[PDB]
Amino acid sequence: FLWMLGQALVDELTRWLQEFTRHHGTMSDVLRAERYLLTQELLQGGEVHRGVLDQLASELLLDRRLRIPELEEAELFAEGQGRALRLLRAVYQCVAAHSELLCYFIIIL
Amino acid sequence: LWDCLILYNVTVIISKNMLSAGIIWDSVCFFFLLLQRRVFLSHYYLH
Amino acid sequence: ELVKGVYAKYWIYVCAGMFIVVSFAGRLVVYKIVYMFLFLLCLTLFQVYYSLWRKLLKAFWWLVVAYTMLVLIAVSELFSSILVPGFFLLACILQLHYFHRPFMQLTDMELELAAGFSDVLSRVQVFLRRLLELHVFKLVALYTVWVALKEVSVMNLLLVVLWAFALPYPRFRPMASCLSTVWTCVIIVCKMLYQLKVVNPNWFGVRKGFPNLGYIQNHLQVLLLLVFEAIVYRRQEHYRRQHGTRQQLDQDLLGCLKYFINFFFYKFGLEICFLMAVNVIGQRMNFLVTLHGCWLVAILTRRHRQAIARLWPNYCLFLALFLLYQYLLCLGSTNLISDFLLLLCASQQWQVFSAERTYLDMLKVAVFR
């Protein structure tokens, strides 16, 4: 069906976009996985710095930690909606990686 | 800084009251400014 | 047969319709009051007891006797009179004969899945109807429309001396409503005899009741609205007589929704009032709204919500007095409705400020980053 074809192509697109952002994605796993979070709810943060930078050369291993406070906490809903939402997630990652190129495009446009 | 921006918005609306263009957009701004001023929490925004 | 008891209870509204045909017929003055508006004042009687809702039977008993007397004395035209009020006296005398109880001495205070959802929804709405959401807001909205934006001058007693002081101080919010019923009943009584009898043109912004239908056509609408609110109130008053705060928040989307549906004005009310003042400013742009705007600056330069809370009784006072002045300026408008909205909102925030206060992570990502 036409619908089914589009679904497959969306997943193909996610893959292609992930291939483009690959390097930046891995640079955001050795840094931003232990950086940006915004999921902690309730009141304030008890162990302030231990709850972020020390949590869970280009491709590092488990030098820091493993996955103690759920590495896949982020990957839960992320992979939960592998269709639609993830297409836009991949789009953002691409433009975050290639923001220099985005600027150039806008100025000539 | 956010409160000073709120005051700027207020004064625009209040000076437009004493006319002698519209406050519609300035009221949208007021809403958003007030929203963000409020969301500067010491809890959720502290995160 | 549930309908047997339903129709034994159905006599008040049955009479109302017959008093509507008694209205604009027979005596333009007397008939209307005696039948329709004295039954509407008997409604007020049981409401003003605040304990005898639909239990007052003494006066409701003699309402029938008064109507029988009228028919016995008097009611094409001999025949008209007869037929017409017998038609309502028939129903009235039937209550006196039997089943006066279901409506007056019984309702007292002392299918499948889809249908299941339907009845739940009925009751949630009615819960909001028995909440301040309906008990007050909707009533005063229609009041302002049908007083300020409608017949001005002498309807100030039905608004700027009532709701302009009842909104800030909710102690007399229900008393105000009962008095309102009474006063608009009085207003229709007065306008019944129009004003064209030997006009020799004391001064209170005399607009004069020249039309018949159109002129009687709005005060009765708010009279009925009071009645409707009272109905839904006393319904759930006897449904209660007989018959998540920050925890649901972090659950999910349903939790967030629930929290705010129940606690919007609880927290947002202050920011609301600030934006309602801007609304008034924009839908006016006069010199009168410089006062509103000056107060806005004052309460916005108070920053900390605790300091705004001690400026709140004076803010609410200003708003109330301003509504009164605005009328006395229009008598001795749409701008009046805007100042009413601000009053209503800020009054509710005065009743919260020093009272009640004393996948969803992606959504939180947006607002909170």
Swiss-Prot record, chain A:
Segments traversing the membrane: 69-109
Disease: Dehydrated hereditary stomatocytosis 1 with or without pseudohyperkalemia and/or perinatal edema: An autosomal dominant hemolytic anemia characterized by primary erythrocyte dehydration. DHS erythrocytes exhibit decreased total cation and potassium content that are not accompanied by a proportional net gain of sodium and water. DHS patients typically exhibit mild to moderate compensated hemolytic anemia, with an increased erythrocyte mean corpuscular hemoglobin concentration and a decreased osmotic fragility, both of which reflect cellular dehydration.
Function: Pore-forming subunit of the mechanosensitive non-specific cation Piezo channel required for rapidly adapting mechanically activated (MA) currents and has a key role in sensing touch and tactile pain. Piezo channels are homotrimeric three-blade propeller-shaped structures that utilize a cap-motion and plug-and-latch mechanism to gate their ion-conducting pathways. Generates currents characterized by a linear current-voltage relationship that are sensitive to ruthenium red and gadolinium. Conductance to monovalent alkali ions is highest for K(+), intermediate for Na(+) and lowest for Li(+).
Intracellular or extracellular location(s): Endoplasmic reticulum membrane; Endoplasmic reticulum-Golgi intermediate compartment membrane; Cell membrane; Cell projection, Lamellipodium membrane
Organism: Homo sapiens
Gene name for this UniProt entry: PIEZO1
Listed name of the protein: Piezo-type mechanosensitive ion channel component 1
Positions where Phosphoserine occurs in the chain: S58
Family designation: Belongs to the PIEZO (TC 1.A.75) family.
Subunit structure and binding partners: Homotrimer; the homotrimer forms a propeller-shaped Piezo channel with a cation-ion conducting pore. Heterotrimeric interaction may occur between PIEZO1 and PIEZO2. Interacts with PKD2. Interacts with STOML3. Interacts with TMC1, TMC2, PCDH15 and CIB2; the interaction may be part of the MET complex. Interacts with MDFIC (via C-terminus); the interaction prolongs Piezo channel inactivation. Interacts with MDFI (via C-terminus); the interaction prolongs Piezo channel inactivation.
Other noteworthy facts: Piezo comes from the Greek 'piesi' meaning pressure.
Tissue: Expressed in numerous tissues. In normal brain, expressed exclusively in neurons, not in astrocytes. In Alzheimer disease brains, expressed in about half of the activated astrocytes located around classical senile plaques. In Parkinson disease substantia nigra, not detected in melanin-containing neurons nor in activated astrocytes. Expressed in erythrocytes (at protein level). Expressed in myoblasts (at protein level).
Swiss-Prot record, chain B:
Protein's gene: PIEZO1
Segment of the intact protein contained: 1214 to 1309 of 2521
Record field: transmembrane: 5-20, 24-40
Family named by the database record: Belongs to the PIEZO (TC 1.A.75) family.
Assembly notes: Homotrimer; the homotrimer forms a propeller-shaped Piezo channel with a cation-ion conducting pore. Heterotrimeric interaction may occur between PIEZO1 and PIEZO2. Interacts with PKD2. Interacts with STOML3. Interacts with TMC1, TMC2, PCDH15 and CIB2; the interaction may be part of the MET complex. Interacts with MDFIC (via C-terminus); the interaction prolongs Piezo channel inactivation. Interacts with MDFI (via C-terminus); the interaction prolongs Piezo channel inactivation.
Tissue expr: Expressed in numerous tissues. In normal brain, expressed exclusively in neurons, not in astrocytes. In Alzheimer disease brains, expressed in about half of the activated astrocytes located around classical senile plaques. In Parkinson disease substantia nigra, not detected in melanin-containing neurons nor in activated astrocytes. Expressed in erythrocytes (at protein level). Expressed in myoblasts (at protein level).
Disease linked to the protein: Dehydrated hereditary stomatocytosis 1 with or without pseudohyperkalemia and/or perinatal edema: An autosomal dominant hemolytic anemia characterized by primary erythrocyte dehydration. DHS erythrocytes exhibit decreased total cation and potassium content that are not accompanied by a proportional net gain of sodium and water. DHS patients typically exhibit mild to moderate compensated hemolytic anemia, with an increased erythrocyte mean corpuscular hemoglobin concentration and a decreased osmotic fragility, both of which reflect cellular dehydration.
This protein's name: Piezo-type mechanosensitive ion channel component 1
Subcellular localization(s) per the UniProt record: Endoplasmic reticulum membrane; Endoplasmic reticulum-Golgi intermediate compartment membrane; Cell membrane; Cell projection, Lamellipodium membrane
Further comment found in the protein's record: Piezo comes from the Greek 'piesi' meaning pressure.
Job of this protein: Pore-forming subunit of the mechanosensitive non-specific cation Piezo channel required for rapidly adapting mechanically activated (MA) currents and has a key role in sensing touch and tactile pain. Piezo channels are homotrimeric three-blade propeller-shaped structures that utilize a cap-motion and plug-and-latch mechanism to gate their ion-conducting pathways. Generates currents characterized by a linear current-voltage relationship that are sensitive to ruthenium red and gadolinium. Conductance to monovalent alkali ions is highest for K(+), intermediate for Na(+) and lowest for Li(+).
